[PDB]
mmCIF file of C-alpha atoms (C1' of nucleotides) in Angstrom:
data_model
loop_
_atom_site.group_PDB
_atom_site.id
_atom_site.type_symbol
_atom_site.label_atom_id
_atom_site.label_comp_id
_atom_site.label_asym_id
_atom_site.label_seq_id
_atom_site.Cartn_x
_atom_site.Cartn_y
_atom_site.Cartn_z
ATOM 1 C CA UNK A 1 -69.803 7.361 28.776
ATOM 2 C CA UNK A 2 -68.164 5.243 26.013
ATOM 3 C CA UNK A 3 -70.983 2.601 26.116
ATOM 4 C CA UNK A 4 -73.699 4.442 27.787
ATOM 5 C CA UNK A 5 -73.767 7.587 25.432
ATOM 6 C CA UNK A 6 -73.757 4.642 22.523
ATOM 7 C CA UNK A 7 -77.363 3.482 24.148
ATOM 8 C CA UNK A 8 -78.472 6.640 24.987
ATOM 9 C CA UNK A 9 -78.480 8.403 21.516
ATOM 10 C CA UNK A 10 -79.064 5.172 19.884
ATOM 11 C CA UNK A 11 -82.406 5.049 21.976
ATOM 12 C CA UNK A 12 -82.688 9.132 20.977
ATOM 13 C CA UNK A 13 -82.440 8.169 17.148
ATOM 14 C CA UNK A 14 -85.238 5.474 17.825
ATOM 15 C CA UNK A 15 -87.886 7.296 18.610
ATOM 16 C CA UNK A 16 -87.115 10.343 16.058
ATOM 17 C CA UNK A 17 -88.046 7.683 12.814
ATOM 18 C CA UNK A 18 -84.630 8.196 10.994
ATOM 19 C CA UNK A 19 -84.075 4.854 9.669
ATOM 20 C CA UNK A 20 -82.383 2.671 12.395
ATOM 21 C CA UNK A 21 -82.894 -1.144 13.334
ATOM 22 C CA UNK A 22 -85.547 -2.048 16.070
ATOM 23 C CA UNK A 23 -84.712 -4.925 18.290
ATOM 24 C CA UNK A 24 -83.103 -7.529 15.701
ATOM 25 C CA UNK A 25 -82.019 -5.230 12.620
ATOM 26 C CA UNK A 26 -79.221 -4.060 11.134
ATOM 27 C CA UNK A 27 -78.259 -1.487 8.049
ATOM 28 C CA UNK A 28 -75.946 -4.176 6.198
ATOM 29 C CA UNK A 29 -74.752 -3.745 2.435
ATOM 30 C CA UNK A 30 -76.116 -6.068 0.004
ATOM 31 C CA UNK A 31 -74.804 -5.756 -3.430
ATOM 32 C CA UNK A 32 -76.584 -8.212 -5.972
ATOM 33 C CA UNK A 33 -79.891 -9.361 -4.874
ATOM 34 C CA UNK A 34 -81.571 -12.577 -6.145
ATOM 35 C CA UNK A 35 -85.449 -11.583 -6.772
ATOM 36 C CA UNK A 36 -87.821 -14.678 -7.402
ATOM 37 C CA UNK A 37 -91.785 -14.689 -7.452
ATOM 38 C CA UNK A 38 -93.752 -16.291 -4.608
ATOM 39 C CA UNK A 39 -93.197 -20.128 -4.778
ATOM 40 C CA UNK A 40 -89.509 -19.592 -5.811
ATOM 41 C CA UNK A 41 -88.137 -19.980 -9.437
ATOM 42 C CA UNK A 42 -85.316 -17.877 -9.782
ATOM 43 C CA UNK A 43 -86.578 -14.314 -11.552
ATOM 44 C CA UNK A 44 -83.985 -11.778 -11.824
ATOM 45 C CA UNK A 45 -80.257 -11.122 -10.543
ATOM 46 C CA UNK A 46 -80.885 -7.294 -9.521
ATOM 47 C CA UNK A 47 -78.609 -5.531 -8.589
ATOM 48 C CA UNK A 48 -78.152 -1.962 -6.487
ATOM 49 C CA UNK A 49 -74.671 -0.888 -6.978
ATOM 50 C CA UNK A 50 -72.785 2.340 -7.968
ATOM 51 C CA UNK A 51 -72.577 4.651 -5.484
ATOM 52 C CA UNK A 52 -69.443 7.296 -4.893
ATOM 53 C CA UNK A 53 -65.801 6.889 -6.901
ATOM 54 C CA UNK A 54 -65.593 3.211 -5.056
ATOM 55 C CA UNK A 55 -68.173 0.421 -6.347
ATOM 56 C CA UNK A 56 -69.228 -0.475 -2.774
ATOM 57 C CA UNK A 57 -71.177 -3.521 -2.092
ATOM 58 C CA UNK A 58 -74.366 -2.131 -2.828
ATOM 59 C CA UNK A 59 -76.788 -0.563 -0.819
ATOM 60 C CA UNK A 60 -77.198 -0.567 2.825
ATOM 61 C CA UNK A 61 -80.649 -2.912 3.866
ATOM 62 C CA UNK A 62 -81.910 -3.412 7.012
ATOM 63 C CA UNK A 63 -80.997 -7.243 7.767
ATOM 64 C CA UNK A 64 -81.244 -8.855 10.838
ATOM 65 C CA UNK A 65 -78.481 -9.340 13.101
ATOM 66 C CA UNK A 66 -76.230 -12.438 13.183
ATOM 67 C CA UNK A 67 -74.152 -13.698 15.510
ATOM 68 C CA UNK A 68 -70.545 -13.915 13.633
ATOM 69 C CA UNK A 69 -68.445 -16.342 11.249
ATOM 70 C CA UNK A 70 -65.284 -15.402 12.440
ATOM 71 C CA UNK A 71 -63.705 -18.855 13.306
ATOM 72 C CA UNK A 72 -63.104 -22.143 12.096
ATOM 73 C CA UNK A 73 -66.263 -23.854 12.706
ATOM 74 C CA UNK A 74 -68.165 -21.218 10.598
ATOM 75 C CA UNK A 75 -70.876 -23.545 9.057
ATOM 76 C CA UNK A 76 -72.689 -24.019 12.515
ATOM 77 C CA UNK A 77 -73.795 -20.466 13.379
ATOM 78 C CA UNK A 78 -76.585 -20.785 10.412
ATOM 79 C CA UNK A 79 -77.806 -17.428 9.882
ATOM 80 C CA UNK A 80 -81.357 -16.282 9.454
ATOM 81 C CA UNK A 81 -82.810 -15.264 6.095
ATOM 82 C CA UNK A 82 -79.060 -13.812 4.769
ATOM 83 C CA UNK A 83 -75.335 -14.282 5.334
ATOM 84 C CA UNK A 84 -72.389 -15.434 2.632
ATOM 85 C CA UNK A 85 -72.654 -15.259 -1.041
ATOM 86 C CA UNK A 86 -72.062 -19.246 -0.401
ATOM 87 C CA UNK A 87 -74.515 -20.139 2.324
ATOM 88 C CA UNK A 88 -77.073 -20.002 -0.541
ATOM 89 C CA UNK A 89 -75.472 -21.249 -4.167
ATOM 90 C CA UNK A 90 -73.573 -23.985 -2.080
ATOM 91 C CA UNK A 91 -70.665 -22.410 -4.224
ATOM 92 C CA UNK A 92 -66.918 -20.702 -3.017
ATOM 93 C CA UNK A 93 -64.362 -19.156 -5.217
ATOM 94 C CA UNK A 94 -61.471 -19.911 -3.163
ATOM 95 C CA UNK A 95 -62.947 -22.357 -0.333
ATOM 96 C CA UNK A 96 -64.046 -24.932 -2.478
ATOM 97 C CA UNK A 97 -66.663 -27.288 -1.716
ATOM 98 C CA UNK A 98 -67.371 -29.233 1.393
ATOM 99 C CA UNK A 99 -67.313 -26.596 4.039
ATOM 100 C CA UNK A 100 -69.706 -24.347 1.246
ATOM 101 C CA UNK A 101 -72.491 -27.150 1.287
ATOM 102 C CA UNK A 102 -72.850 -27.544 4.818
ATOM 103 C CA UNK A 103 -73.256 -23.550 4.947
ATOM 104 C CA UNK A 104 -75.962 -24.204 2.657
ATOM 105 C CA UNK A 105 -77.229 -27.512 4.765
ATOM 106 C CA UNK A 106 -77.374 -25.281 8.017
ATOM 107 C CA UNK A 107 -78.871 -22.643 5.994
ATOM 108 C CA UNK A 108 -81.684 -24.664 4.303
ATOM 109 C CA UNK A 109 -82.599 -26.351 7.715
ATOM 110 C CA UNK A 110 -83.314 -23.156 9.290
ATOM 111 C CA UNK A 111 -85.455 -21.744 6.429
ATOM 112 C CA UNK A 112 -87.260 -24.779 6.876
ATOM 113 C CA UNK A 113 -87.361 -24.746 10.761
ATOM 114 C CA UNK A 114 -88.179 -21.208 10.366
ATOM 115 C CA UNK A 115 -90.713 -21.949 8.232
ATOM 116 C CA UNK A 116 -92.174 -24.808 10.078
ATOM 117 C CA UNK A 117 -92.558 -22.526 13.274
ATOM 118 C CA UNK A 118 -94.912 -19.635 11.214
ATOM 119 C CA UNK A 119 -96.523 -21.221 8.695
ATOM 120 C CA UNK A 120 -98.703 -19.343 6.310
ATOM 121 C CA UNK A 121 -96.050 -16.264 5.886
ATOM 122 C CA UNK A 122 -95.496 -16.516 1.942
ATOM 123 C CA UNK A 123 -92.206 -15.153 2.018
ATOM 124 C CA UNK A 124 -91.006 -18.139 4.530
ATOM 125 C CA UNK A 125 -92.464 -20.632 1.790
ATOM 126 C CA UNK A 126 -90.089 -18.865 -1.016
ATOM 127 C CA UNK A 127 -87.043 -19.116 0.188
ATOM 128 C CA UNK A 128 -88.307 -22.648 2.027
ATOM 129 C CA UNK A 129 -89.062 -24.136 -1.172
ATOM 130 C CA UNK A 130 -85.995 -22.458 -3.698
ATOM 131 C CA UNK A 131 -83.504 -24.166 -1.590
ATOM 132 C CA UNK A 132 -85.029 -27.520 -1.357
ATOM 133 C CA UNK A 133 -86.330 -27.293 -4.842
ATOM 134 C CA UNK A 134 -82.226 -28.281 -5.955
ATOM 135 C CA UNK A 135 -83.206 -26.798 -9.613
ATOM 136 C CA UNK A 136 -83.120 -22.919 -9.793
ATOM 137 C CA UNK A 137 -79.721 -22.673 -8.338
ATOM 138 C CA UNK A 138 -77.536 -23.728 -11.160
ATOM 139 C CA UNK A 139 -79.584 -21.338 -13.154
ATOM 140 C CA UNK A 140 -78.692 -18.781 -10.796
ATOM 141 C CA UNK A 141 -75.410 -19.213 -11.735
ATOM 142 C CA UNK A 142 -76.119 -18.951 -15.571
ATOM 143 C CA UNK A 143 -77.769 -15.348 -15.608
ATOM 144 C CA UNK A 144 -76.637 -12.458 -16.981
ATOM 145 C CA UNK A 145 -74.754 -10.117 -13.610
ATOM 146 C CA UNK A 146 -73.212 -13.140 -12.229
ATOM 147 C CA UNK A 147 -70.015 -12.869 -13.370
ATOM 148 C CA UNK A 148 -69.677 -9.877 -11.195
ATOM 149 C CA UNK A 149 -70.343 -11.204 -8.276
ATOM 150 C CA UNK A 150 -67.376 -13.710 -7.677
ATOM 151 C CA UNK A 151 -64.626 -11.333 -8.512
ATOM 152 C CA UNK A 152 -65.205 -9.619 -5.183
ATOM 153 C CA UNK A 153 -65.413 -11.059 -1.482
ATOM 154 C CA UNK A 154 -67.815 -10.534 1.164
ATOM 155 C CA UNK A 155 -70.375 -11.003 -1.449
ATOM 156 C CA UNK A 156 -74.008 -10.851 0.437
ATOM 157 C CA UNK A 157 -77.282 -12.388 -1.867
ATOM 158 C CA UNK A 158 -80.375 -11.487 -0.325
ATOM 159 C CA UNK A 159 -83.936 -12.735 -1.510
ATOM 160 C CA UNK A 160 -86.771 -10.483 -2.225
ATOM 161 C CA UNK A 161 -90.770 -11.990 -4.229
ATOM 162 C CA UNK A 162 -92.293 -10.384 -6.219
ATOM 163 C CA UNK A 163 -95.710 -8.153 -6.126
ATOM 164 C CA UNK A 164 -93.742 -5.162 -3.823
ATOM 165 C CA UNK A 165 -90.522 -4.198 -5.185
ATOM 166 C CA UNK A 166 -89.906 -2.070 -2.301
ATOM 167 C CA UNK A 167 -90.176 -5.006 0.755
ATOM 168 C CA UNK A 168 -87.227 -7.074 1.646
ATOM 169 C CA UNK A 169 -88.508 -10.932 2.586
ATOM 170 C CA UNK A 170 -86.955 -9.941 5.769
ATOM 171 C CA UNK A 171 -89.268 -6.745 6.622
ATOM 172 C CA UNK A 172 -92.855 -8.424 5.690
ATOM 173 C CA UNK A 173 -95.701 -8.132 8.267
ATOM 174 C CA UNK A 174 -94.901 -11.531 9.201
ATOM 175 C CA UNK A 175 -91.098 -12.068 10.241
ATOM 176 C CA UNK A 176 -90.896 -8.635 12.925
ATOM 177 C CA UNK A 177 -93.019 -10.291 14.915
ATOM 178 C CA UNK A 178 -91.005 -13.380 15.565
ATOM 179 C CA UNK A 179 -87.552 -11.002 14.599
ATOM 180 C CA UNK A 180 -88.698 -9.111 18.174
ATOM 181 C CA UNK A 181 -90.007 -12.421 20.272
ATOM 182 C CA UNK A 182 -86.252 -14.165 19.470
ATOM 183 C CA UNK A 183 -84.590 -11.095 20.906
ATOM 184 C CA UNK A 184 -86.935 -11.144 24.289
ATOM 185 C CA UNK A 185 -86.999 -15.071 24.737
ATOM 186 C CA UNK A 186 -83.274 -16.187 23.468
ATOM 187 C CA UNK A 187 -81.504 -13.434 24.962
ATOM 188 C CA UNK A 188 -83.526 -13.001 27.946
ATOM 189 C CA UNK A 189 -82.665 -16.709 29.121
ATOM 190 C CA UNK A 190 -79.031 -17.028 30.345
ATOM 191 C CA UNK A 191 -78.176 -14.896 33.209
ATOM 192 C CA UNK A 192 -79.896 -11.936 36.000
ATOM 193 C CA UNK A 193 -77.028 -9.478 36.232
ATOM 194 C CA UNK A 194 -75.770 -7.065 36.317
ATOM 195 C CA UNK A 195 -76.014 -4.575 33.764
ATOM 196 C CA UNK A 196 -73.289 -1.751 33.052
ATOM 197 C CA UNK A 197 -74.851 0.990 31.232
ATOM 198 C CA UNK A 198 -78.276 0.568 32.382
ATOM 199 C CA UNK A 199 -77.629 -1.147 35.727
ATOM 200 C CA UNK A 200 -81.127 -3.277 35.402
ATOM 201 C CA UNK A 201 -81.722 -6.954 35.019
ATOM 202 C CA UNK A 202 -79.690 -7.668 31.187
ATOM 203 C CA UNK A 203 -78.073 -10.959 30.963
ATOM 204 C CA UNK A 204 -74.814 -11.689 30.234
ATOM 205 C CA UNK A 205 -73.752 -11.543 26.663
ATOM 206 C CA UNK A 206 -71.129 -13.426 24.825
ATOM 207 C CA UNK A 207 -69.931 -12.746 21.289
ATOM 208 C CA UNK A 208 -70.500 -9.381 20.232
ATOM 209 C CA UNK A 209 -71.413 -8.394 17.129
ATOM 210 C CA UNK A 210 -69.350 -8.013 14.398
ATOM 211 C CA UNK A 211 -68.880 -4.063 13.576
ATOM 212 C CA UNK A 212 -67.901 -3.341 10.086
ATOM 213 C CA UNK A 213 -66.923 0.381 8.898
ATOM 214 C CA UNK A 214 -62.830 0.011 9.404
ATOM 215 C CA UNK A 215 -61.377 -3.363 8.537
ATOM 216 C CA UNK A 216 -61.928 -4.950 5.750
ATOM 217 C CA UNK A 217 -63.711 -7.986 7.479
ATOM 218 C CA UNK A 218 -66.670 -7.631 9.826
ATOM 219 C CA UNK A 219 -64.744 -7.419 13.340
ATOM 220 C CA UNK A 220 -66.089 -7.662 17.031
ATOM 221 C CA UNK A 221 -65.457 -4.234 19.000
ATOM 222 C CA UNK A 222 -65.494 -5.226 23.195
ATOM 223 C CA UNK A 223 -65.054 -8.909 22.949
ATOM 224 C CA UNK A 224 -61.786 -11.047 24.139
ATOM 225 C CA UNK A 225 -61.476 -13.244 21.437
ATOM 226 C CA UNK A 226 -58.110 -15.488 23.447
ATOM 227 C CA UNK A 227 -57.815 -15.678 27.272
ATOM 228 C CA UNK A 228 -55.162 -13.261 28.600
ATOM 229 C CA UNK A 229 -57.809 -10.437 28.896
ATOM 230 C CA UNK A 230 -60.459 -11.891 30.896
ATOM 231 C CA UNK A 231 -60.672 -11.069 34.567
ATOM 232 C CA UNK A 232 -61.024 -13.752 36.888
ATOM 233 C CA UNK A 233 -61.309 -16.487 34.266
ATOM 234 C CA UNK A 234 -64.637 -15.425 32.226
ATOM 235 C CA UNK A 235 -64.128 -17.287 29.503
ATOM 236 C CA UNK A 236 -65.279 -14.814 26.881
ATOM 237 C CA UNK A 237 -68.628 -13.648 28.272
ATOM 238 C CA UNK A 238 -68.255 -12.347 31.721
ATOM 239 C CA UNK A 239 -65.587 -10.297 31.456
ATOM 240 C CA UNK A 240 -67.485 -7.329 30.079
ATOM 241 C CA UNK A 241 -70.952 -7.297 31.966
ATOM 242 C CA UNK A 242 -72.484 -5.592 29.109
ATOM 243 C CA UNK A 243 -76.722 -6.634 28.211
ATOM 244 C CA UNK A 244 -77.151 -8.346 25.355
ATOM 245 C CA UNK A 245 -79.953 -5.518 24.474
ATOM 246 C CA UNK A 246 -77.544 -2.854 25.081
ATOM 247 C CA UNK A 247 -74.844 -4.730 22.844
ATOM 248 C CA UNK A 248 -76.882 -4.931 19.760
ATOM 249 C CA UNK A 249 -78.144 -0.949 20.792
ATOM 250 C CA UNK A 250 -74.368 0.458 20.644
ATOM 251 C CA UNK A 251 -72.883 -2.569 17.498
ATOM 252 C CA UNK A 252 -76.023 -1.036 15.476
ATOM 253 C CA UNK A 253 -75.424 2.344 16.135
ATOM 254 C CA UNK A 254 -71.759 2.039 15.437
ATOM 255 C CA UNK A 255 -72.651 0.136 11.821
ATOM 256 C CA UNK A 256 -74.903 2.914 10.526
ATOM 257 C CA UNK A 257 -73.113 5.958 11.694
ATOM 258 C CA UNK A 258 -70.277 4.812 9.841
ATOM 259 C CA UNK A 259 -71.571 4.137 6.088
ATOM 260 C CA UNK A 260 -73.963 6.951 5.915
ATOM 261 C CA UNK A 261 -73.359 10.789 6.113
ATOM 262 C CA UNK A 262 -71.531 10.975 9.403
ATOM 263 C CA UNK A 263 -68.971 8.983 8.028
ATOM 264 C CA UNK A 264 -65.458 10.513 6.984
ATOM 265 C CA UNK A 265 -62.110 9.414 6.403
ATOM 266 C CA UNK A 266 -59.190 11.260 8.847
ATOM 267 C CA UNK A 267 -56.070 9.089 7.944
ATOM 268 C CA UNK A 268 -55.906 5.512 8.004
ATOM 269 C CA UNK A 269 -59.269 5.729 10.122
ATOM 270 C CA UNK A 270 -62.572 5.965 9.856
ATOM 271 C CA UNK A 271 -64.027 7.831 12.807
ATOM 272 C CA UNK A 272 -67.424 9.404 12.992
ATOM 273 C CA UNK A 273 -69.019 12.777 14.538
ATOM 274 C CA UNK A 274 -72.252 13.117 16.025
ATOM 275 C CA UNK A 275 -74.114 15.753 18.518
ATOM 276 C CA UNK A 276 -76.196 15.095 21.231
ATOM 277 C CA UNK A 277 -79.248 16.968 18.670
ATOM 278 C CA UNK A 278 -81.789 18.093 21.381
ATOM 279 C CA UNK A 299 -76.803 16.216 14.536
ATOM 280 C CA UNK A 300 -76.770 19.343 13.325
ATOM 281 C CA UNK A 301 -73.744 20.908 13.639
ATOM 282 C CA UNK A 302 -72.644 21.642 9.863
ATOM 283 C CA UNK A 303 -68.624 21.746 10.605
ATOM 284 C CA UNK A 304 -67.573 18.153 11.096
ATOM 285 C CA UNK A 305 -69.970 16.165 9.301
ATOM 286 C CA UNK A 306 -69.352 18.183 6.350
ATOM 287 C CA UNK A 307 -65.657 17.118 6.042
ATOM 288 C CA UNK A 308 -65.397 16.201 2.148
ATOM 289 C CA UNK A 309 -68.520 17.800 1.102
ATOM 290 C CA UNK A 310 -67.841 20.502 -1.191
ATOM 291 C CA UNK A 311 -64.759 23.122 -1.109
ATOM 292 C CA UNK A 312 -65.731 23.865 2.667
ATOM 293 C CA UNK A 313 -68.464 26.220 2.430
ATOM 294 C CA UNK A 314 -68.836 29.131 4.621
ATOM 295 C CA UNK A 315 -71.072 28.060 7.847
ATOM 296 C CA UNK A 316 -69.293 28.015 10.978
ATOM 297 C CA UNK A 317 -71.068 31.056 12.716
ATOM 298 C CA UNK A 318 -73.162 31.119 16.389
ATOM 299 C CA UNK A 319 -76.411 30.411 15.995
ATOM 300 C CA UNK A 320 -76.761 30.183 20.071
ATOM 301 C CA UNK A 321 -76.614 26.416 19.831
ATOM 302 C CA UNK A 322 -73.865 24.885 20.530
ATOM 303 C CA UNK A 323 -74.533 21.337 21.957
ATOM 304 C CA UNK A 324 -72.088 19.313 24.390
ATOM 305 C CA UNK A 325 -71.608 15.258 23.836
ATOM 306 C CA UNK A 326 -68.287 14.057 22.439
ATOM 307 C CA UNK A 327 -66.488 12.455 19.648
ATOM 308 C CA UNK A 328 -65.825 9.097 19.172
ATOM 309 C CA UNK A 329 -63.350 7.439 16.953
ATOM 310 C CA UNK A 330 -62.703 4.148 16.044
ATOM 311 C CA UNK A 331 -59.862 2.416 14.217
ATOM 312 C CA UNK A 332 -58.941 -0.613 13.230
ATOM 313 C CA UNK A 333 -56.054 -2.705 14.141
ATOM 314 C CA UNK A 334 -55.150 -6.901 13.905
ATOM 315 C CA UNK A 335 -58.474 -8.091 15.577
ATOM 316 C CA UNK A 336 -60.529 -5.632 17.200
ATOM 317 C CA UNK A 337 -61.017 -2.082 17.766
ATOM 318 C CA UNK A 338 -58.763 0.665 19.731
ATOM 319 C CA UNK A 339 -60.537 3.738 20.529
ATOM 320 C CA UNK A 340 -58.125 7.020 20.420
ATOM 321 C CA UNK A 341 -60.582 10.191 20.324
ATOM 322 C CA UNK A 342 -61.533 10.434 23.525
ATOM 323 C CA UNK A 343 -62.544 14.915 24.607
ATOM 324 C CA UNK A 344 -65.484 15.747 26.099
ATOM 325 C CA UNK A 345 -65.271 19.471 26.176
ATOM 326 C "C1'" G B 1 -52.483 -10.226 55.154
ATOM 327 C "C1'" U B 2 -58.037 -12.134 50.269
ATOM 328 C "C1'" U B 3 -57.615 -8.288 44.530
ATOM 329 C "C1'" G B 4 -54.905 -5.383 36.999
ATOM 330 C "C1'" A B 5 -52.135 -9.141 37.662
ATOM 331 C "C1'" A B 6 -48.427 -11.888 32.883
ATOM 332 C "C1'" A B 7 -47.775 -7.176 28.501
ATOM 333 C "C1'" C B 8 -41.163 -5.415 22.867
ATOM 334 C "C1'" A B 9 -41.485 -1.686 19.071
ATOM 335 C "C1'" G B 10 -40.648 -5.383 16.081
ATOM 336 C "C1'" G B 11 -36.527 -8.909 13.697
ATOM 337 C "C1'" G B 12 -34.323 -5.036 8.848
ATOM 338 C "C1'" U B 13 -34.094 -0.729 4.749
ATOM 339 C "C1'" C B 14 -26.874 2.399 2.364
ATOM 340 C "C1'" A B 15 -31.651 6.067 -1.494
ATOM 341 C "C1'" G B 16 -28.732 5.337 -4.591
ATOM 342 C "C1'" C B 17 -26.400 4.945 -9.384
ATOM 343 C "C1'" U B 18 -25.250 10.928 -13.307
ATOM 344 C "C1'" U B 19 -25.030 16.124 -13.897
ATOM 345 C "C1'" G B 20 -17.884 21.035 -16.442
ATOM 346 C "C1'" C B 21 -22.310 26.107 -14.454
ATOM 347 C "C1'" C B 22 -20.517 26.190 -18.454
ATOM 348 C "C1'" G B 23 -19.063 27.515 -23.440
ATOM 349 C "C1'" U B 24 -19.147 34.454 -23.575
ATOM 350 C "C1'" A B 25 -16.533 39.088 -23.548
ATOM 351 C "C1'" G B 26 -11.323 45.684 -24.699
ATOM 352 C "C1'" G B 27 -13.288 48.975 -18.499
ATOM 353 C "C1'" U B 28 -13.046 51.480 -22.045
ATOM 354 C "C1'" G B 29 -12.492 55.364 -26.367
ATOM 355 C "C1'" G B 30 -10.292 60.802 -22.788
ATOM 356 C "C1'" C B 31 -8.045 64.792 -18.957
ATOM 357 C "C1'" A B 32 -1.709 70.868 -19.255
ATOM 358 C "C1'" U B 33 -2.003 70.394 -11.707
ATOM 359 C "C1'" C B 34 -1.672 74.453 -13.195
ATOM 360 C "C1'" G B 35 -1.581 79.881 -14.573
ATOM 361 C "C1'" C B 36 1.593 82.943 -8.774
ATOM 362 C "C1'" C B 37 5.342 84.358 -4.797
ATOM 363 C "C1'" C B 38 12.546 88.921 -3.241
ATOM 364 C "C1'" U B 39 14.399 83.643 1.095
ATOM 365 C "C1'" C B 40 14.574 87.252 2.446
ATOM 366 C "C1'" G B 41 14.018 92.600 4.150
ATOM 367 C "C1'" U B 42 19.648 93.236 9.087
ATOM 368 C "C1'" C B 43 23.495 94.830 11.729
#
RNA sequence: GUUGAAACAGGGUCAGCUUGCCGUAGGUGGCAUCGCCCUCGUC
């Protein structure tokens, strides 16, 4: 019920079209975005900021997934198409060098790899040939935003061509395709069984995602980052025999229902209140809205579900809200 | 005699130094306890 209700509406939200991620997505913030044109050369420094009373960073984009740079060795996870503000400019504010241009060595062989295995994508030959083309990134540096970008950490510089202003380079006609193949081949390859929430085939999966909403670093949720909490010697993997497909269903949902609307601030938490829908309920969600309006009535509706609530703590996540009725 | 085990609230924090409830003031200017009665009628 902690897990499967995660799946369950995340697979309800799905299939009503309200803005979710699809096998290989996820809502992430990106505050300044580098746009170019179509064979690179460094256009604008854009920018998508100012939201509520706190400059957040930026808007939330729908990225996909990565698989964590918690750790020491955080140079050879090489993200897709997006990750560090330094995986890109080869550049650190308080890191330095030498562990920045590796980020950008790992990152620059997967564009190309990426590029090499779908050809003919235009999108994959921008950001292919801007960070081989060892010219437009010091003028990145020298434009007119910059300045603002390494005062802050967590700093996230996504690319975007021109001729759409309203496509990401990661949500082309082009890049879904092989987004949805990597999630059915990669993830499909390492164990048979067995599933918890959905009790099918599901491999094992090791390293959960990263959820972000409560600490102010992107933080795993169910994942045994030592040794003294595995059961009979797992070694971080096989300890929770959770599908990698339901994994990424319940790390999503957790990242976007706790940015957007549903997302309030109790005290010293960040917890999050949702109805099962078939939500709507117009007394929890509406927690700092206004001056509490008038609309608690009974409108012979009244759904079941629970409430969930995170919080942060040294490492991972405790749960406390835990009431069914 | 083959199965949740191995799990600390924490080492420590004087809530203090300062503050007269006080300088501030007539309970008073004023009112006959009295106009009235055989302690005796007596052998």
């Amino acid at each position: 019920m902690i897990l499967h209700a995660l799946t369950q509406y995340y697979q309800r939200k799905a299939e009503s079209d309200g803005g979710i991620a699809q096998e290989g997505f996820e809502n992430k913030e990106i505050p300044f975005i580098i746009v170019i044109d179509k064979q690179g050369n460094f256009i604008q420094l854009e920018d998508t900021r100012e939201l509520k009373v706190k400059k957040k960073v930026g808007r939330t984009f729908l990225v996909p997934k990565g698989l964590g740079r918690s750790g020491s060795k955080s140079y050879e996870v090489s993200n897709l198409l997006w990750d560090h503000y330094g995986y890109v400019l080869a550049y650190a504010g308080e890191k330095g060098q030498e562990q920045a241009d590796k980020q950008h060595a790992s990152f620059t062989a997967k564009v190309n790899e990426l590029k090499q295995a779908l050809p003919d994508d235009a999108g994959v030959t921008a950001v292919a040939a801007f960070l081989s083309s060892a010219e437009e990134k010091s003028k990145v540096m020298q434009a007119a935003n910059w300045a603002e970008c390494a005062k802050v950490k967590g700093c996230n510089l996504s690319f975007r061509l021109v001729d759409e202003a309203v496509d990401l380079v990661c949500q082309s006609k082009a890049v879904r395709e092989y987004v949805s193949q990597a999630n059915q081949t990669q993830s499909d390859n390492a164990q048979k069984g067995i599933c918890l929430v959905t009790g099918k085939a599901a491999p094992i999966a090791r390293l959960h995602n990263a959820v972000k909403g409560v600490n102010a670093k992107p933080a795993p949720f169910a994942s045994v980052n030592l040794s003294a909490f595995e059961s009979y010697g797992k070694e971080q993997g096989f300890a929770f025999p959770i599908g990698e497909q339901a994994m990424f269903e319940y790390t999503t949902a957790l990242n976007t229902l706790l940015a957007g609307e549903n997302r309030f601030r109790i005290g010293d938490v960040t917890t999050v209140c949702w109805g099962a829908k078939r939500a709507h309920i117009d007394a929890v969600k509406a927690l700092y809205k206004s001056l509490y309006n008038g609309q608690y009535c009974k409108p012979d509706g009244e759904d079941k579900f629970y409430l969930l609530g995170l919080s942060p703590n040294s490492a991972r996540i405790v749960v406390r809200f835990w009431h069914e009725t």
